[PDB]
Amino acid sequence: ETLVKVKDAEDQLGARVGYIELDLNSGKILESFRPEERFPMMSTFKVLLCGAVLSRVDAGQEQLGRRIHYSQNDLVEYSPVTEKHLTDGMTVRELCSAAITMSDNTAANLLLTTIGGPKELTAFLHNMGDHVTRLDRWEPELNEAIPNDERDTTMPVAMATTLRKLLTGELLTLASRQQLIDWMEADKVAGPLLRSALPAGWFIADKSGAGERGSRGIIAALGPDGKPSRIVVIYTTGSQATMDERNRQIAEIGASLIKHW
């Protein structure tokens, strides 16, 4: 029973939690809890990053086949795929795949370079109606989560609404919406969160994030019968619990909103 659970999770972590569930088609909000407090995006921002990328593809300003050669100084903390292509480079499409499915930090920075940086990601977001979400720093510093720092934060409602627009609007072309959600479906490093409590037949495309100071979250489009019908977004920050406890609290919110769909 979700809002209950969400409230339960808050005092079990001893941190702020924020939650929203949004109907994918209509845009109607189904429930929420602190939808408008701000939270570190962490690696959830990688999906927005790649939407800004596809948007430039759509506009003939970028090619997914464009190959980017980079070098040892571009590598930052957590580069499981990019360390391996120092020599041969990676295409924009490969970069988005690595950033989203494996949360590769270097990949995300390399992509931020293509669009001209964090302020271009904020401007892209701002220009489609999201006047709240902002990216300010590169990896790995964007994950610091200083208390009350609004750098690199979103609100559950701003991220849910923006994800909806990217994934079904006319904001991107059909080919781009589909690639964006394909990248999220192949998510590979989010098994212990929503995917954890999802039943066979269900579709799930998601992106998770973890940052410092206990910060954790996920964004997801999911539903029954292999089709996404809802957007769910959960952030938490401030907590001293263990990495697996918080993990547990979020599986718990999703076991609930899955039960009470």
Binding site: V81, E83, K84, P140, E141, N143, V189, P192, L193, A210
Partner: protein, 154 residues
Amino acid sequence: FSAEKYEQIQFGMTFDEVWEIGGGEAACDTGGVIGDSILCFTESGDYAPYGGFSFTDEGELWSKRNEYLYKAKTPSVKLSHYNRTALGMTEAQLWAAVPKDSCVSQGESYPNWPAKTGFEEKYYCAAATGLFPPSASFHLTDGVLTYRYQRSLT
């Protein structure tokens, strides 16, 4: 997959041997952006610890790498220590300047396999606990320092 499996994996081993020790299909990936190589993850989750493995054209393991399979016993590197490292210093010289308990290996490789010359080791030294602390990174080739970098050390 786990650190203890990473230590079982040996230079020269074939793709199938690595895959088997690493955990096979449950823990490891190959293909797509990984190409012919193998990536194994210790658990799901953002920034999950991992090991990666690459093979020669002849099928033999020449490279092992990881992040976060190990954690420094005593995160304590200071920019002071870092300022007293220089390219050309030996590995023993390195450990006389930087506390080894503040560092962990993030890989080993033989870029000339099956010749052993040019062996490379990568060390990652956290200045503090937590996810992305300030740090120093050092790479040595055949026991000699050939790369040094630091981010945000005091």
